[PDB]
Design a protein around this motif. Structure first.
Motif, PDB file in Angstrom:
ATOM      1  N   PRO A  36       0.679  -1.175   0.145  1.00 29.00           N
ATOM      2  CA  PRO A  36       0.125   0.080   0.007  1.00 29.00           C
ATOM      3  C   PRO A  36       0.949   1.143   0.056  1.00 29.00           C
ATOM      4  N   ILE A  37       1.999   1.170   0.696  1.00 31.44           N
ATOM      5  CA  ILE A  37       2.934   2.319   0.471  1.00 31.44           C
ATOM      6  C   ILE A  37       3.433   2.796  -0.841  1.00 31.44           C
ATOM      7  N   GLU A  38       3.488   1.723  -1.388  1.00 26.56           N
ATOM      8  CA  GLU A  38       4.169   1.842  -2.667  1.00 26.56           C
ATOM      9  C   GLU A  38       3.083   2.223  -3.814  1.00 26.56           C
ATOM     10  N   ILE A  39       1.937   1.590  -3.489  1.00 26.14           N
ATOM     11  CA  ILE A  39       0.731   2.109  -4.337  1.00 26.14           C
ATOM     12  C   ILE A  39       0.657   3.529  -4.395  1.00 26.14           C
ATOM     13  N   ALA A  40       0.728   4.157  -3.070  1.00 34.07           N
ATOM     14  CA  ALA A  40       0.443   5.378  -2.986  1.00 34.07           C
ATOM     15  C   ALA A  40       1.537   6.422  -3.469  1.00 34.07           C
ATOM     16  N   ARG A  41       2.749   5.571  -3.455  1.00 28.26           N
ATOM     17  CA  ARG A  41       3.904   6.466  -3.921  1.00 28.26           C
ATOM     18  C   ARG A  41       3.998   6.843  -5.240  1.00 28.26           C
ATOM     19  N   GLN A  42       3.766   5.398  -6.016  1.00 28.02           N
ATOM     20  CA  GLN A  42       3.709   5.374  -7.488  1.00 28.02           C
ATOM     21  C   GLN A  42       2.474   6.170  -8.000  1.00 28.02           C
ATOM     22  N   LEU A  43       1.423   6.162  -7.362  1.00 30.75           N
ATOM     23  CA  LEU A  43       0.310   6.971  -8.006  1.00 30.75           C
ATOM     24  C   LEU A  43       0.675   8.389  -7.721  1.00 30.75           C
ATOM     25  N   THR A  44       1.333   8.818  -6.718  1.00 29.33           N
ATOM     26  CA  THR A  44       1.513  10.182  -6.540  1.00 29.33           C
ATOM     27  C   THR A  44       2.491  10.680  -7.541  1.00 29.33           C
ATOM     28  N   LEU A  45       3.650   9.661  -7.909  1.00 29.63           N
ATOM     29  CA  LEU A  45       4.321  10.280  -8.985  1.00 29.63           C
ATOM     30  C   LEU A  45       3.662  10.385 -10.376  1.00 29.63           C
ATOM     31  N   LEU A  46       2.801   9.582 -10.805  1.00 29.27           N
ATOM     32  CA  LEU A  46       1.956   9.637 -11.931  1.00 29.27           C
ATOM     33  C   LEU A  46       1.295  10.924 -11.815  1.00 29.27           C
ATOM     34  N   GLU A  47       0.376  11.053 -10.624  1.00 34.03           N
ATOM     35  CA  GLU A  47      -0.514  12.146 -10.663  1.00 34.03           C
ATOM     36  C   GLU A  47       0.255  13.496 -10.287  1.00 34.03           C
ATOM     37  N   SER A  48       1.293  13.537  -9.842  1.00 37.08           N
ATOM     38  CA  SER A  48       2.209  14.850  -9.941  1.00 37.08           C
ATOM     39  C   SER A  48       2.771  15.141 -11.253  1.00 37.08           C
ATOM     40  N   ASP A  49       3.270  14.043 -12.114  1.00 41.01           N
ATOM     41  CA  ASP A  49       3.473  14.543 -13.358  1.00 41.01           C
ATOM     42  C   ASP A  49       2.322  15.028 -14.073  1.00 41.01           C
ATOM     43  N   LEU A  50       1.253  14.181 -14.013  1.00 40.95           N
ATOM     44  CA  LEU A  50       0.039  14.749 -14.757  1.00 40.95           C
ATOM     45  C   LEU A  50      -0.123  16.342 -14.199  1.00 40.95           C
ATOM     46  N   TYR A  51      -0.125  16.571 -13.020  1.00 41.73           N
ATOM     47  CA  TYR A  51      -0.379  18.039 -12.661  1.00 41.73           C
ATOM     48  C   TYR A  51       0.480  18.940 -13.127  1.00 41.73           C
ATOM     49  N   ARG A  52       1.807  18.512 -12.965  1.00 44.11           N
ATOM     50  CA  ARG A  52       2.896  19.561 -13.509  1.00 44.11           C
ATOM     51  C   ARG A  52       3.022  19.913 -15.211  1.00 44.11           C
ATOM     52  N   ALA A  53       2.137  18.930 -16.087  1.00 40.92           N
ATOM     53  CA  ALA A  53       2.182  18.990 -17.238  1.00 40.92           C
ATOM     54  C   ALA A  53       1.049  20.060 -17.772  1.00 40.92           C
ATOM     55  N   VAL A  54       0.204  20.486 -16.689  1.00 40.03           N
ATOM     56  CA  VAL A  54      -0.893  21.228 -17.367  1.00 40.03           C
ATOM     57  C   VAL A  54      -0.522  22.879 -17.396  1.00 40.03           C
ATOM     58  N   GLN A  55      -0.584  23.333 -18.531  1.00 40.89           N
ATOM     59  CA  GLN A  55       0.034  24.694 -19.072  1.00 40.89           C
ATOM     60  C   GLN A  55      -1.191  25.743 -18.917  1.00 40.89           C
ATOM     61  N   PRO A  56      -0.938  26.880 -18.738  1.00 43.48           N
ATOM     62  CA  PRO A  56      -1.937  27.942 -19.018  1.00 43.48           C
ATOM     63  C   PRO A  56      -2.823  27.954 -20.133  1.00 43.48           C
ATOM     64  N   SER A  57      -2.184  27.624 -21.359  1.00 39.45           N
ATOM     65  CA  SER A  57      -2.720  27.794 -22.531  1.00 39.45           C
ATOM     66  C   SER A  57      -3.989  26.724 -22.718  1.00 39.45           C
ATOM     67  N   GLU A  58      -3.865  25.719 -21.999  1.00 41.77           N
ATOM     68  CA  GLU A  58      -5.182  24.728 -21.760  1.00 41.77           C
ATOM     69  C   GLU A  58      -6.279  25.251 -20.653  1.00 41.77           C
TER      70      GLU A  58
END
Lengths: 7, 449, 166
Positions: free
Chosen positions: B186-208
């Motif tokens: 469960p720790i690693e699930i949360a960690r890898q999901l946080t890495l995916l979702e942080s990348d998803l959040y960081r890629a959103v630009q103001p133009s969108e």
């Protein structure tokens, strides 16, 4: 009362 | 100081209540007054003002101007602003008007090409015009600003500490065939999901985001990273629900719900609020919320953990908004509030104000939108000190709980599963066989070391 | 005084936010700051009784389809909104209402059907179609105009009456 997770 | 005739240079018309209004109760930032509204001429003038630089106005303008001014038109306007005709005392005018105004124009071009290059990627002619203009600029004062702009343009046309040890439970490294909610740690699930979702959040630009483009018919074209992020979140919520209601044996289902609360706990520790709200939305869904027999066996401590998380969403996210203001990066904010606020700011304020019969661009509405996009950028800066596990990451990137079904068919199937495993009173509660061969006990959410 | 939790439900991309914004603005103030509590809470007097309307409108978060249950769970009354220039939004109403009934676990949820004229675009949903749908559900139909504010107050007050008479 309330939510299934309310103590 | 004496300027040219408005007849020959449009930016020489004096300020009036028909061409620029300021905010009359806001403190100026760094001695600069806050522009409320203005003609595009006046907005361009203040964007390239001779008395001082205004980096915050420049940022807001270049982020939000496309609603009132097209990119080709803005280029024509700042070229026109750069070409200042003279009306001895020319030394003063040349020194305190022409030269600083021209430096402002070059600074605007530089910030345009550096932080908003998508305008040029989508309109090659716009980039042709910009390179032409820069090539015509011949002065000793502008030489190194011109050169720096060219360097940027040409470029665009092309941890301190170590991370914690990766955690493993029943599934062993490299055994993807057995990866699942209960077999991964469960720790690693949360960690890898946080890495995916942080990348998803960081890629959103103001133009969108500006112009509320994600809500219009061309959203798939203008907001693809935002939509990819939202669809990841939706997917994880639905996978959580599916794991719950397709575990038909009660004891096992209690194990599934308890393991999901454990993942939420680690989401909280990581400040992944997108993860927190994925879990909260799953627990609030019709198929899961009614499972009284399951929540009955959830230990009270995990009930309180879920309760705290759910309460974040109550009262229009009051506690979530305070918690986020108080934490420091890295985190993953929940994006939905940003989207609602940008949408309602754009739709709930007039594009234009009228003064003495004259139309003025309502700029303070754009400033408000740019405040929201700036808050988003501020959380995109800091990454997580966590190691990727390629196979876990891949497993969560390819979760497809809906399969080939349409939304309605699939959520009706989840609801009917819920009704089967825990029928409406006064139908008796049936029993169902176990489906898991391995032990249900959780390793917990504290590291092994 | 009594507080009513209202939830706006309906299709995105057709300006449903105009409804709540217009209720909330002063009728002569065109500003709106959605980032403060005063933007979704309003004290009003309906049929001589004072009450506080708390209005959830999640406009912009329509792609978060798995959060609809969470959001609907907070409401006791629902405005189901479609745009009179967008037939698809009118067609979505049926499923939205099925979902409200499942979330509230009740066949009889206080709700109102609202046809919103937000555009200069041509009407494609005739008032008779919408009156017939509303009647087949046993709920009121109200039409509103985003440019004049006609109908807005009526839509919210009718929903409050539906809660008081439940």
């Amino acid at each position: 009362x309330f939510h299934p997770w309310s103590v | 100081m004496r300027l040219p005739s408005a007849d020959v240079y449009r930016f020489a018309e004096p300020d009036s209540e028909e061409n620029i209004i300021f905010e009359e109760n806001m403190q100026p930032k760094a001695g600069i007054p806050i522009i409320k509204a203005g003609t595009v001429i006046k907005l361009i003038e203040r964007l390239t003002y001779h008395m001082y630089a205004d980096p915050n106005f420049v940022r807001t303008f270049l982020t939000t101007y496309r609603s009132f001014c097209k990119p080709q038109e803005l280029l024509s306007l700042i070229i026109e602003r750069f070409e200042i005709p003279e009306p001895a005392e020319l030394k003063r005018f040349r020194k305190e008007y022409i030269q600083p105004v021209q430096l402002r124009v070059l600074n605007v071009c530089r910030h345009w090409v550096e932080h908003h290059f998508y305008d040029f990627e989508r309109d090659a002619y716009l980039l042709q015009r910009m390179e032409e203009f820069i090539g015509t600029v011949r002065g000793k004062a502008m030489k190194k600003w011109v050169e720096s702009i060219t360097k940027i343009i040409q470029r665009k046309k092309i941890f301190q500490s170590s991370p914690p040890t990766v955690e493993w439970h029943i599934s062993r490294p490299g055994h993807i065939e057995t990866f699942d909610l209960l077999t991964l740690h469960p720790i690693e699930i949360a960690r890898q999901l946080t890495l995916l979702e942080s990348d998803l959040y960081r890629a959103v630009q103001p133009s969108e985001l500006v112009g509320s483009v994600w809500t219009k018919e061309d959203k798939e074209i203008n907001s693809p990273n935002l939509l990819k992020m939202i669809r990841h979140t939706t997917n994880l919520t639905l996978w959580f629900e599916k794991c719950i209601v397709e575990t038909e044996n009660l004891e096992e289902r209690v194990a599934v719900v308890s393991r999901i609360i454990e993942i939420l706990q680690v989401f909280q520790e990581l400040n992944n609020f997108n993860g927190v709200l994925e879990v909260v939305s799953a627990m609030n869904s019709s198929p899961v919320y009614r499972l009284d027999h399951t929540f009955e066996q959830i230990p009270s401590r995990q009930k309180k953990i879920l309760e705290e998380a759910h309460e974040l969403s109550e009262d229009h996210y009051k506690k979530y908004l305070a918690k986020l203001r108080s934490i420091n990066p890295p985190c993953v904010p929940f994006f939905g509030i940003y989207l609602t606020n940008i949408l309602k700011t754009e739709e709930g304020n007039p594009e234009v104000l009228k003064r003495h019969g004259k139309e003025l661009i309502n700029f303070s509405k754009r400033r408000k939108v740019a405040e929201i996009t700036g808050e988003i950028q501020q959380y995109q800066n800091q990454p997580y000190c966590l190691r990727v596990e390629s196979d876990i990451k891949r497993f969560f990137e390819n979760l497809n709980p809906m399969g080939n079904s349409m939304e309605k068919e699939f959520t009706d199937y989840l609801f009917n599963k819920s009704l089967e495993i825990e029928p409406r009173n006064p139908k008796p509660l049936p029993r169902f066989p176990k489906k898991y061969s391995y032990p249900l006990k959780s390793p917990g959410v504290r590291p092994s070391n | 005084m009594t507080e009513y939790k209202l939830v706006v439900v309906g299709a995105g991309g057709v300006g449903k936010s105009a409804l709540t914004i217009q209720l909330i603005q002063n009728h002569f103030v065109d500003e709106y700051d959605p980032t403060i509590e005063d933007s979704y809470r309003k004290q009003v007097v309906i049929d001589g009784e004072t009450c506080l309307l708390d209005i959830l409108d999640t406009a912009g978060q329509e792609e978060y389809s798995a959060m609809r249950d969470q959001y609907m769970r907070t409401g006791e009354g629902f405005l189901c909104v479609f745009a009179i220039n967008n037939t698809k939004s009118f067609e979505d109403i049926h499923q939205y209402r099925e979902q409200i009934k499942r979330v509230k676990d009740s066949d009889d949820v206080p709700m109102v059907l609202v046809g919103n004229k937000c555009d200069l675009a041509a009407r494609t949903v005739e008032s008779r179609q919408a009156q017939d749908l509303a009647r087949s559900y046993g709920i009121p139909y109200i039409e509103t105009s985003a440019k004049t504010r006609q109908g807005v107050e009526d839509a919210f007050y009718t929903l409050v009456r539906e809660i008081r008479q439940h």
